[PDB]
Amino acid sequence: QLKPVDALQCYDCHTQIEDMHVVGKHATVNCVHCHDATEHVETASARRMGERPVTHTSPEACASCHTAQFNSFASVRHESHPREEKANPRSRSPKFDTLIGAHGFSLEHAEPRSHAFMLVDHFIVDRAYGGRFQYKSWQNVTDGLGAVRGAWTVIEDMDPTTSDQRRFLAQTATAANPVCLNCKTQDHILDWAYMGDEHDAAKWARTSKVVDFARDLHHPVNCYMCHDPHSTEPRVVRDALIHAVVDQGLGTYPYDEAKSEHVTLTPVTFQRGGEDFRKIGLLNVADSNLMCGQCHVEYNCNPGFQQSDGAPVGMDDRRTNHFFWANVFDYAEAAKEIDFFDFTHVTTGAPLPKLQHPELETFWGSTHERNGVTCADCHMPRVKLENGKEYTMHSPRTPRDMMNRACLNCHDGWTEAEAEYAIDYIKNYTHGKIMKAEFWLARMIDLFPVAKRAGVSEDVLNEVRALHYDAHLHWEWWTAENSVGFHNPDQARESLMKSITKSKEGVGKLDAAIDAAVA
């Protein structure tokens, strides 16, 4: 049973926390709810931490006073198909194995499921840790509350005696590295320097042994990722987001200068031994586009290569923790700005980008974004109660489960069936274009070995490799992006038609050169 501490004693040293805490809606909430600092208080100085206090990072620490939000946060949507592979005629990318080749995603790329599972799913997917981590039982796949309480309560390490990345099962990969975890958990928020730079005060960095880092982490999407625990104010904590918006001055809405003045991030920096260590970004308004955009964006969180000379770019380089902060039509220029590509296609030899869930950068410029709508309006609205305080739901999911709040409050002349039909019209149209982009891209790729074997020149092959970069970018954006065009149907349509145009041009060039060489 908790005993409150003398907050004034803490404030004597912790003046920034004092300024945040005394002024906001947690002014009456005592430190003991989230910190055990008895030995710390006995041993600290103005400058030395002394004994490190415990910080309780479980979402359950908030549940004593916010049970409603915590229960919603831990909830599971069983209708979100679990562990469903995308390289599959029943899913998003039937030809993915041809198109992605030997990239790590070829070992497994499933569709997303409920937020409660995010850290568990990161740990156990076949592409991440060589199959090292596994659910303790296949019964455990249902346990959202268990996952929230801690990954290691439901999964286990197949070899606690070693820390190396290796394969435990034949068809797995070891693609995980420490940067990944920033979009799964912030349990390490006090143990990771801004951007993951090596730092005297950081136990973990981009260059850490990822198996050891994994074992130190527990909880998914911590509540304090979107709310400052001291002031309650809305914020973001994700380093690479703050870097793009603030350090690089690109703004919260990089395509809209006025909106970027209306929605702002105010950086706060915390130090260790008088040296800058970590940052947060305080929001002036609770804009969920920025909160959700901590994770639902295209990023680098992985080694790659330089476009200029092909040299490896490893985890020591800041480019391996980067938000591109660009729409699909600006992405190629943004990747050139950092002189970077992800992988060389195993079949075609083309340098290629690897794209991931660019929801926010797709949403920019869309009709709903232009009308001031945000992610949470459609995916995470308030509950509706005849006789209750209407809190915000806290496990985002498709608007199909909540159409009256998500759509019909604005679109008041539609029935639920009509609004869903409008969704399906866009998704069906967009999916059809994705299928055709895959047909043409796979056709181009399958012709590369024919061309090489027929003696087609390097000049022709290099021309088509350059087309492959763009054919790939303007296809993969849309298999990566989870709305199947709904977030921006006109952009999806223009981009996918560009992918097809490029692949058709590449097929034509290869067929002509093969026929000439023959022969």
Added chain:
Amino acid sequence: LKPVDALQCYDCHTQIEDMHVVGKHATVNCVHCHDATEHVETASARRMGERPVTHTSPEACASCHTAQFNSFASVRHESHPREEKANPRSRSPKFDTLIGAHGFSLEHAEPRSHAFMLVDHFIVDRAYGGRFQYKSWQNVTDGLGAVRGAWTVIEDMDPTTSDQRRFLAQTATAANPVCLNCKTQDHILDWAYMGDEHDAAKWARTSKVVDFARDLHHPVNCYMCHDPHSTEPRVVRDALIHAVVDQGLGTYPYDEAKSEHVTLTPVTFQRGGEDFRKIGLLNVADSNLMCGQCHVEYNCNPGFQQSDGAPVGMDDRRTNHFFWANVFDYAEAAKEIDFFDFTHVTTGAPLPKLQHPELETFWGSTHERNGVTCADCHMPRVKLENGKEYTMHSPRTPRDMMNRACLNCHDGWTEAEAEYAIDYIKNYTHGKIMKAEFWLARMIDLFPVAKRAGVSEDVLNEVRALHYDAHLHWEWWTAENSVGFHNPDQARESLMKSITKSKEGVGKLDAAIDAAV
């Protein structure tokens, strides 16, 4: 059908021309509703010649208005059919005590769907002595058949005679020609204004009702609310025109400004130059007036004079009368025409008989004050994602259509909330009706005890006067079908008045009995 030359008709029918050429039926030929070949061959402008036929079936309109016709014939199976009200499961458990020997004691069922109204009027146990009966108990479901014609589904047990008499032991012969005006207007060209005897009218208040019944077929004819020549909104019910115009009360007798905004313009049709029949053209399609042609308290029956007790028979216009007054003005209105309905068989008190006063109850209520009308809650437009949204044509409880009937205005309520608010009012009102019955029955049951104990005529007469008001302020609410929802504060005040009167009467009888003993 082959169209007639309407220009030829107009040469002798300027009154119809003026209505037909300007409205939305200008292109609709006379042949849809009239057979006039022999009429044209034989008429002059001053001589009818052969009487042309006028088609009065709602199905005459269905050639071009099938959507409205289909809705009009529809049946709500959830509206409990042939359910007696003198019943612990229905509106008036002590009705047999309270009404005594009145004709309604033979049978008084709850209403059901409009399609059955004429059929139900013909076959109820209190109307024709059981003379008319469904041909089979299977026929009770047949709304469409009833619309097409009562005599396709019911039959006369003795076509060879025309007298009112009992065919079954517990029946009554309460029907008379005035009843039919709220069931059908098939007789619209055969009935003079108010049912006065008239050379041009084959039927009148004084007609042999059994013969009149056999000439009638269809329920609530479409043209009761719509002029068939111009399409404009109208009423045709004589007693309503008489209340609004002849009695000078106006369309909304409790709101002078609203009576100026909603106007009834009477139009009279002549026969051989003598006034014969009337309609009332409305300036707006006001369903309060359209529905109030029938859903009102009325006389449509013989009675007695308050002054001297003399019978008032069907020859007297008072037997076709709309009081057009709220419950608190009703006693005054009935005194104005010197009329009461019956003498209670037990107490000997002159009493009024009240019937479904929905319009006069609705007046002054919150919804009426806000411009809502009957059809807004009971007969709204259909709801279609991709269609022309026509108006439904068989009125029913808003519980079947809550979004349209209530939640479009009350946008902060769920369906369950709105129904909850209905039920709160109906439950509360029903509880007061039960208490009013308890007390009125206790008072009535004490009359024989008082008489047998030798209580004086003076005391009995004081209590008979109280009976009039205790009865009025109870029966209004068993007669009115909303169980208070139409005007909850008025139901509350009125029922508490009934109870107060009955309690006073009980006290007076008990004191006199005790003294006499």
